[PDB]
């Protein structure tokens, strides 16, 4: 048969037309010709290169573009659009033969090649799927809500007979319905056959609920949701919370006795996914050379300071604290007996309208393992470890909380002041021991919580009062206040020029965002931070001990004389940790003197600005040599 003969149909439906052996073999031959002979008039065969790439990568997925097939054989594209299941089976066999043309031993490795159709033209929302789309290919966008675990579904089903013990041949399991055998072919009996799992082959299975993206829903309408079944290679591809686009066959899920509550013969619908498309902190060989090139600049650190939160303007010391917390120091354990913490905890205490929450959102976007939590809010991950039983699943699960979940990362606690008692205790343990101990529901254990904390708080009464010291402006007690390395107090004092530039920045941000209308790039910066966190590990050498010990006594005696809350050893440790964090931005294996001076500047500025104004006036003049 020919393509023009394929255009004419003789059977009652399209599916019965494709079911005929002659039409099936004609479609197989035409798909073979399309797969082996398609070129983009540039002298290269894109599909041959794709087959070679999937063979050398040992993958069972072949991406076939729909517009290529539409330009090549439009009638086969229409057949795929109307009846995708059996034509996809045909093209599975065709692609398998095309792969065996190059690699003759690929059948024993996989024996299954999945064809993924990309760039389907018709775009449907989940709220406009109707009667006409059943057993047809639909391309729908949406946000994944939650996903199930990967389950083994039977693929090549093998039985054994209870009468004789003979093991029967493998049979293909159709995804639509369960398969069953009634004959033994050895003892010639219709006896009870049982499926043995050791000789049965399985495919992976996942069940993913997709809703309409909330941006695109009409006003009074709720976002519609469908359920998508991911097969063997597509499992664990789309994490919940991200906007994804799935091409697949829209079909009915069959259930026993329909629905008794409705009283109408009503079926539920599923989408068997054909392809998943997403609408990464991996550095290549060129990326590390680029990182070394950008590190050798003298003013690299300031650029990172200028790269923190571009939508936030003027809070340079806050951005410096963000950069120090994002890069972090090195933890250490001398002889196993004594442990020194190696990550910077930053407390942003500020009046309303100082854009602390936007800084927290920026860090959540930038950091590798960033966990957002809040004290007053409800729909967020908690700060306390718990053992929780699902009311429906009846399954006990151990939740480590946001502190354990932010291990080797950063935890961002918005509204640090109106926290409750259990969350305060969780934070206290997570900063003291860097671990969380649980004794609940028969589970007695400890979970590592080596997490940096960037917290945001509002002062008591809605304003910072500079006449009172820091402890009287915040509901936080002394031990939890002492655990922070950088203590950024930001206040919106009235300055005319600052107000003018801030208002200009905000109004310009609005006028750029209208629908009718030297910083490092973010993508480079995120991988740079990950690289410096994961491979640098700076170290400080012995001949710089004569200056840090000098400046430590210089601050301690002045703190005694002035009468503020004392400088302890932990301020020296904060100096030495912030120094190791600043040295990471240079990708440096050692700690330099300007590095230490900058860390001392950060710690001195953080200690001074948290004081009574009487303390501020003396401490600014006494520590003028270190602030510079």
């Amino acid at each position: 048969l020919t393509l023009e003969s394929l255009s004419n149909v003789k059977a009652n439906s399209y599916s019965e037309w494709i079911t005929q052996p002659n039409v099936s073999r004609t479609i197989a031959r035409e798909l073979k010709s399309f797969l082996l002979e398609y070129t983009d008039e540039t002298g290269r065969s894109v599909y041959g290169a794709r087959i070679r790439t999937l063979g050398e990568m040992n993958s069972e997925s072949l991406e076939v573009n729909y517009r290529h097939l539409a330009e090549s054989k439009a009638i086969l594209a229409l057949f795929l659009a109307k009846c995708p299941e059996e034509m996809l089976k045909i093209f599975d066999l065709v692609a398998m033969e095309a792969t065996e043309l190059h690699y003759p031993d690929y059948a024993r490795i996989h024996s299954e090649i999945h064809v993924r159709i990309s760039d389907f033209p018709t775009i449907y929302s989940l709220r406009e799927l109707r009667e006409s789309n059943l057993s047809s290919l639909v391309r729908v966008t949406g946000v994944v809500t939650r996903r199930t675990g990967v389950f083994p579904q039977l693929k090549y089903v093998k039985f054994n007979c209870l009468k004789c013990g003979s093991i029967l041949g493998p049979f293909f399991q159709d995804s639509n319905e369960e398969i069953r055998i009634s004959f033994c072919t050895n003892c010639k009996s219709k006896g009870p056959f049982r499926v043995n799992g050791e000789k049965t082959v399985y495919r992976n299975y996942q069940r993913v609920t997709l809703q309409e993206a909330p941006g695109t829903v009409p006003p009074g309408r709720l976002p519609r949701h469908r359920e998508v079944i991911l097969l063997a290679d597509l499992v664990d591809v789309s994490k919940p919370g991200e906007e994804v686009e799935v091409t697949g066959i829209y079909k009915n899920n069959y259930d026993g006795n329909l629905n008794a509550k409705n009283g109408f013969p009503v079926f539920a619908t599923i989408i068997e996914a054909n392809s998943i498309k997403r609408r990464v902190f991996s550095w290549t060989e060129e990326e590390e050379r680029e990182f070394r090139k950008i590190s050798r600049d003298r003013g690299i650190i300031d650029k990172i300071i200028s790269s923190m939160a571009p939508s936030i303007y003027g809070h340079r010391d806050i951005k410096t604290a963000v950069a120090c917390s994002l890069f972090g120091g090195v933890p250490k354990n001398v002889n196993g007996k004594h442990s020194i913490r190696g990550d910077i905890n930053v407390l942003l205490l500020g009046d309303p309208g100082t854009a602390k929450s936007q800084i927290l959102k920026y860090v959540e976007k930038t950091a590798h393992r960033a966990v957002f939590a809040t004290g007053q809010g409800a729909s967020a991950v908690g700060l306390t470890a718990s053992v929780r039983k699902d009311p429906i699943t009846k399954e006990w699960t151990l939740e480590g909380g946001a502190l354990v979940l932010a291990d080797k990362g950063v935890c961002l606690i918005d509204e640090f002041d109106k926290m409750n008692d259990q969350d305060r205790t969780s934070i206290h343990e997570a900063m003291e021991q860097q671990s969380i101990s649980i004794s609940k529901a028969g589970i007695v254990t400890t979970l590592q919580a080596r997490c940096s904390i960037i917290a945001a708080a509002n002062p008591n009464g809605g304003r910072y009062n500079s006449t009172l010291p820091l402890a009287q402006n915040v509901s936080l007690t002394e031990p939890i206040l002492s655990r922070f390395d950088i203590l950024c107090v930001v206040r919106d004092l009235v300055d005319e020029e600052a107000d003018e530039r801030l208002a200009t920045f905000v109004v310009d941000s609005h006028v750029r965002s209208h629908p009718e209308n030297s910083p490092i790039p973010q993508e480079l910066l995120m991988k740079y931070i990950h690289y410096a966190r994961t491979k640098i590990y700076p170290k400080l050498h012995q001949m710089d001990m004569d200056k840090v010990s000098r400046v430590y006594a210089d601050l301690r005696r002045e703190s005694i004389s002035t009468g503020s809350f004392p400088i302890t050893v932990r301020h020296l440790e904060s100096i030495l940790r912030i120094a190791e964090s600043f040295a990471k931005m240079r990708l440096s294996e050692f700690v330099s003197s300007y590095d230490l001076d900058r860390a001392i500047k950060v710690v001195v500025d953080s200690f001074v600005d948290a004081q009574k104004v009487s303390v501020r006036r003396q401490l600014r003049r006494s520590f003028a040599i270190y602030t510079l």
Binding site: K332, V334, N335, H338, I340, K539, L540, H541, Q542, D544, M545, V548, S549, Y552, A553, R556, R557, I560, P566, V569, L572, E573, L576
Partner: protein, 49 residues
């Protein structure tokens, strides 16, 4: 202030303990130089050796 005036609890718990230790900040240069050098050797790695 009295030792029982600085505690945020009753004075009976103090009698309840076996040995009490009132730990001081001595607040002088000759001690905090030594403490600073000790902590710097801890961070350096000399103290491990």
């Amino acid at each position: 202030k009295s030792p029982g005036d600085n505690i945020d609890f009753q004075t009976t718990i103090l009698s309840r303990f076996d040995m009490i230790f009132i730990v001081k900040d001595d607040h002088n240069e000759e001690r905090d130089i030594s403490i600073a050098n000790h902590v710097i050797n801890i961070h350096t790695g000399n103290a491990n050796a």
